[PDB]
């Protein structure tokens, strides 16, 4: 089977990876960077995001494990002493899928983007202020720092810092969370997260400047001359090699908890 | 088809009930209030919950209709004015289901019970702990004044006053919510709002008292010697006779915004 | 001098306590839990509290000192290690001095209660509704699970788990936070916590039931046919002898961050 | 008295500013925008905010009035047509102070600022992580978005929308709050806004990067290769010209009640 592995590049992981290539150079394995069936990333969540970017144009074709040099990782959750029983088992898995966030930007005279963790707007250097249409319908002028909207693997993330929920990946939804909403007499949001099911479209709308700072998981672009900003559920997944049970909420009790 | 109407007993309400029986008397419309087919319920969602507990037994038989002689309501969507139109359409529908919760009681020496908006668990006079169980696995000791267990339709109500996100009622799911946890160097809670797939079990388990106060919707008992509080996805569903469209969004936007 | 110590009534406790009071036998010290200058406390926040309660009628000439055989309190906050330097010290210090709050509850047909932690109030079974009003004016109506009232030192207890800010002891004031308040188009409350100096008088009063479960620190009481209930800031303090530093901030630090 | 006017720039203030000038040319007062005694400010709380800043180096010899065009502000709390009253009244008052903030940013190879209502700290591109030292003491270390440190007055402001408490500007003091700070197993910050009295000092140390965002009210810029930010209650205070009641918690009430 066709694999690559990408290092977080300290002393550490590059040593892990050329101990994994060595180990792969024992079975039917090659090497291929370029149409891997198999993407080992080697360091954090930040190597793993980068892994599933580099590979977005594949997603259907490729299963993903990450290996976490430093502490566990939500995505990259297997530990380096057990890198050896990985190679075998690889050489010889089930596949779990997870929900991922489509980003469409439209302009002025369009740009989609995937998210595995989530997608963010704020301004460009003054108030931001947009208006927030759920299917077509007006549900709100949002007047704050900005917004998230964030899979269901990334609600451990920003989301969560945000006041947002923790949902398990198998729910096929996404979910919108406020930064720094103001609400007065004059001025009215939700306040609370909003969780959208397959196939709602939430569209943002700018009431005044057109310029906004946005981000897809690491990626952060000023974009000009916005006319909209449309986050759905993507039809594509992610999906993982499964080698041994590692259930999510106890991977969220193993980071949170203890 | 055989019908009743319950009424918040209010003058506007009762009298509002009498004139639609008497326009019902005009069409093959039967009143029965032991095997209705149709369960109108008129005042507010108070009311409408009232209903939906009267007829629990039998809600694969049963569409729900609520009109709202007070403020608008989530579950009583209609308004007075239209109870004519709404004589005349039902008399000759789609039907819309939403996704209910089940709590199992156990005991020494077990009881269940169904939830439209979401079960709570307080103390009976004293501290609440409670180990915190999901699919068997041991997720967080929690001590705080309580946890709330809401449907997706619910948590619009005591689960959006504890921090919990909306969720559209299309999504089968449950969420849990913290109230007042204590967190610090010793005790630890995930804080979060938590949101759970269907087929996923969430256990509550005494770690000293085992007396809880426990509620259903509008009902509140003090349960003696518990043993554990369990809580899924119910197979069950609340069906709704819809006649035109009123999507939730704007139900929410209705509601809380303007 | 005249001193007393209560214990926890756990073993180790216990024997602290017969040992601080040989090691007193060698000094001029009497005990007296009658009429002490001196009052210590032996085993957590708790043992503290009701220390503090059984002596809050002579405040002004006692000096606290609470010892943690458990973890680290908030007032129990010196080591069993530690109470032979204690005996001597208190044999031969300074005082320091944190704000208290005053409750006034009136009826139909008056009584006062001091805080060290703080005061909540909730309803007796049923729906909590109350108006509330400061110095006179009418700020809001409140509707939710009840509201609570805490000192300056009790911002790092209840207040802290709903949501309310951490402020300093030297600080004469008092914060005011939400249980699960409801707000929706119809119900509004500020939603903040707030912080009053001394002088204001933040009134709960009655819209409804006029029953209420009051609490104050440690003790829950239901009050009968309630019409007001007054909040201020106590001209009262509680006295503690100090013999070395120990900052707020850090004892902040050591209880929450490590 | 030496006065002058600011204008928001819009019809409406730039009319009402030339009409009060035209009322003041009745009495004994001349304008004066180089010395005034009196500073009026005509337009929101923007407008009021900018006259601060214009006038914060004679902070002790002048009195300011807010008026409001638009909607009512906390600064800006009188009317228009309540101009010619305050012309009249003005001509022939007594004083309210509230406290302000002081920001000191300090280098390599230092910068003071003075903010009515908060300073905020963000980075500049990239992870914003600082070590936060409260009077000499480490306290934590924060992983986030910034933080922001508030006035009294400054406490309805950011302040509100971060989750921070409102307090009575009669209270020497100032208040940080977070923006979503990370906490899991590993990294841990207090989550609670911190409430600090005069005298204390806040200072927030890089860790890695040591270019931030600093904002103070209204005005926010770009700081290179900073060592040190610190924050304390200023020595210096606002001063108001007081001609009616019009009590801060009325002024909150009315800006986010009703
Ligand atoms: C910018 C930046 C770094 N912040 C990322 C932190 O969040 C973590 N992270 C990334 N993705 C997730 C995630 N999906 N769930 C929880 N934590 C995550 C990452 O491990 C690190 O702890
Ligand atoms: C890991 C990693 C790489 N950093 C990207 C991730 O950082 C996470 N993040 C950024 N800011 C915060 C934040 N302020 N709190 C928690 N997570 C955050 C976010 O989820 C993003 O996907
Ligand atoms: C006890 C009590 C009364 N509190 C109920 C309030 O919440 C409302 N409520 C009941 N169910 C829901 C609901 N499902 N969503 C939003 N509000 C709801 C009810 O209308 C009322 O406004
Ligand atoms: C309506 C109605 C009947 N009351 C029952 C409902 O009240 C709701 N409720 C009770 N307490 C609160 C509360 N404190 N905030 C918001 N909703 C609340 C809860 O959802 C419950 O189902
Ligand atoms: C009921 C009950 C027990 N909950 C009390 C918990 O809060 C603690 N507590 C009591 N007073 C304070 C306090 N003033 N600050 C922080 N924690 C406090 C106590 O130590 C214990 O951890
Ligand atoms: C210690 C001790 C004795 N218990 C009394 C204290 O418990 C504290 N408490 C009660 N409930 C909670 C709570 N839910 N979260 C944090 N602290 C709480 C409260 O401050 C009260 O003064
Ligand atoms: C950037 C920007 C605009 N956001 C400012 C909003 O907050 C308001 N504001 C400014 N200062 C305060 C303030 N001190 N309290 C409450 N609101 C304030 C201002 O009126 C406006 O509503
Ligand atoms: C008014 C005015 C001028 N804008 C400055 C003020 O905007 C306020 N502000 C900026 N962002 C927010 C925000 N996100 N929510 C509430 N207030 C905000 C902040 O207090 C600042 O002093």
Same mark, same amino acid.
């Given at each position: ?98 929900? $991922? ?7 002025? %005279? /369009? #740009?989609?983007? *995937?998210?595995?963790?989530? !997608? ?41 810092? $945000? ?7 198998? %729910? /096929? #939804?996404?979910? *919108?969370?406020?930064?720094? !909403? ?52 993507? #039809? ?23």
């Amino acid at each position: 089977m066709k694999y690559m592995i990408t290092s977080k590049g300290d002393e550490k992981s590059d040593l892990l990876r050329l101990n994994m290539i060595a180990g792969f150079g024992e079975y039917d394995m090659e090497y291929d960077d370029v149409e891997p069936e198999i993407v080992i990333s080697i360091g954090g969540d930040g190597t793993f995001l980068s892994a599933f970017h580099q590979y977005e144009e594949r997603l259907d074709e490729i299963a993903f494990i990450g290996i976490h040099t430093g502490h566990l990782g939500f995505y990259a959750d297997w530990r380096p002493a057990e890198a050896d029983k990985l190679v075998k088992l690889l050489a010889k898995y089930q596949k779990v899928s997870y929900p $991922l966030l489509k980003t469409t930007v439209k302009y002025g %005279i /369009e #740009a989609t983007y *995937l998210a595995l963790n989530e !997608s963010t707007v704020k301004s460009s250097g003054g108030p931001f202020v947009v208006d927030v249409v759920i299917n077509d319908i007006h549900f709100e002028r949002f007047r704050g720092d900005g917004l998230c909207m964030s899979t269901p693997s990334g609600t451990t993330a920003y989301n969560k810092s $945000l006041g947002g929920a923790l949902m398990h990946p198998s %729910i /096929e #939804a996404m979910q *919108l969370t406020e930064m720094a !909403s103001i609400n007065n007499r004059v001025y009215r949001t939700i306040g609370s997260p909003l969780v959208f099911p397959k196939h709602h479209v939430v569209s943002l709308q700018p009431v005044n400047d057109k310029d906004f700072q946005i981000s897809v998981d690491h990626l952060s672009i000023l974009h000009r001359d916005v006319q909209e900003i449309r986050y759905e559920v993507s #039809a594509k997944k992610i999906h993982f090699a499964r080698f041994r049970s590692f259930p999510f909420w106890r991977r969220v009790h193993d980071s949170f908890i203890e």
